[PDB]
Amino acid sequence: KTEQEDVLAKELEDVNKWGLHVFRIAELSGNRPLTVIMHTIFQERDLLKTFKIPVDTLITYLMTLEDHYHADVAYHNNIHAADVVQSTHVLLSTPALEAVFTDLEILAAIFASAIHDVDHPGVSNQFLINTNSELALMYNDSSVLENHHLAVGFKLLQEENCDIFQNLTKKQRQSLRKMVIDIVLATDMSKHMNLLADLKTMVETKKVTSSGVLLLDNYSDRIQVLQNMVHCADLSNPTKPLQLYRQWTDRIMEEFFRQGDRERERGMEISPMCDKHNASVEKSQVGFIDYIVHPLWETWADLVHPDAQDILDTLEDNREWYQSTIP
Numbered sequence: 001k002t003e004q005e006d007v008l009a010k011e012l013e014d015v016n017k018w019g020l021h022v023f024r025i026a027e028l029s030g031n032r033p034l035t036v037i038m039h040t041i042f043q044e045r046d047l048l049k050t051f052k053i054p055v056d057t058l059i060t061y062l063m064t065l066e067d068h069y070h071a072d073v074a075y076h077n078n079i080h081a082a083d084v085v086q087s088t089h090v091l092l093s094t095p096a097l098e099a100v101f102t103d104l105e106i107l108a109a110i111f112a113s114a115i116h117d118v119d120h121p122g123v124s125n126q127f128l129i130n131t132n133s134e135l136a137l138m139y140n141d142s143s144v145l146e147n148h149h150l151a152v153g154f155k156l157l158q159e160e161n162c163d164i165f166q167n168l169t170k171k172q173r174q175s176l177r178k179m180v181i182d183i184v185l186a187t188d189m190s191k192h193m194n195l196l197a198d199l200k201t202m203v204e205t206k207k208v209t210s211s212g213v214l215l216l217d218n219y220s221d222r223i224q225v226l227q228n229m230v231h232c233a234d235l236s237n238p239t240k241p242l243q244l245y246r247q248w249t250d251r252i253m254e255e256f257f258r259q260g261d262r263e264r265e266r267g268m269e270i271s272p273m274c275d276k277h278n279a280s281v282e283k284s285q286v287g288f289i290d291y292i293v294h295p296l297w298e299t300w301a302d303l304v305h306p307d308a309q310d311i312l313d314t315l316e317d318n319r320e321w322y323q324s325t326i327p
């Protein structure tokens with residue numbers, strides 16, 4: 001190992017921890033954060049042995065999947081996907097969910113997190129509809145990005161030596177496929193309110209086992225937990241250490257701004273958050289936390305109480321900090 005590989009290996013020791021230095025791992029890995037975090041996680045969960053995944057097929061698929069995130073998109077890139085994968089991996093290990101999910105369900109959630117934004121062009125669903133894009137025409141204006149992320153992520157499995165599921169039974173693949181689709185479609189923000197409503201209902205009627213672990217009889221409850229889990233991981237930036245959070249805010253703002261520039265050059269009304277001439281980055285973060293991120297994470301906290309109390313406290317501190325900069 002070179003000196004660089006020893007440092008990367010040292011950083012990969014935090015893969016079970018909230019607030020892994022995902023940006024450092026991106027650098028140290030040669031802009032391969034998604035490949036090496038996914039590989040590290042499959043080895044940590046013993047997923048190659050369980051599902052008989054050839055290590056070379058895994059790496060080949062991951063590189064190809066990573067290749068299909070856009071290096072020139074400021075936020076929705078391979079780093080974001082590595083971060084959602086890693087955050088989902090931590091959420092799966094929460095005490096209140098020990099022994100709840102099967103290895104197939106855990107693999108579906110981690111796989112869904114990896115592909116969940118692949119080939120993202122850096123512009124919103126609404127932009128794609130408003131501009132009469134091929135994607136919007138293909139998908140009839142409904143979860144346009146999220147359907148595409150799924151189609152690409154599954155299609156790459158067909159490339160040469162890329163089918164990491166080749167040793168699953170036909171039943172296993174079928175169930176995994178449906179779960180992944182269910183999970184990635186749940187990342188569309190236009191599903192957020194109804195997804196949170198179901199999660200609140202579940203919290204209020206929560207049933208536990210004799211060990212104190214969540215009890216989920218049926219597909220409907222199990223998939224809804226997984227959907228919200230990946231959704232929380234997708235919206236986990238404000239819950240991270242401040243120096244991670246602020247970098248995610250810089251990147252999402254740059255990407256929103258470049259969408260607003262494209263709306264400018266096309267004579268369109270500039271979407272909220274996308275006008276770099278009338279922006280309010282701090283106030284918008286506080287609003288997003290207050291109307292979206294905190295309602296979601298407070299409810300997830302309730303579901304697994306008290307496993308997530310520190311994540312929720314970091315969220316609240318980060319909100320107070322952004323708030324404190326406004327006046």
Ligand SMILES: COc1c(O)cc2oc3cc4c(c(O)c3c(=O)c2c1CC=C(C)C)C=CC(C)(C)O4
Pocket residue numbers: 189190237238248249252272273284285287288
């Ligand atoms: C117009 O609706 C908004 C809005 O007012 C603010 C928004 O702010 C966001 C801030 C974000 C991120 C966001 O996705 C948003 C928003 O989407 C956002 C939106 C759009 C909201 C909806 C369509 C429900 C992602 C990562 C971090 C770094 C946490 O920053």
Ligand SMILES: [Mg+2]
Pocket residue numbers: 116117145187188
């Ligand atoms: Mg997305």
Ligand SMILES: [Zn+2]
Pocket residue numbers: 080084116117187234
């Ligand atoms: Zn995402």
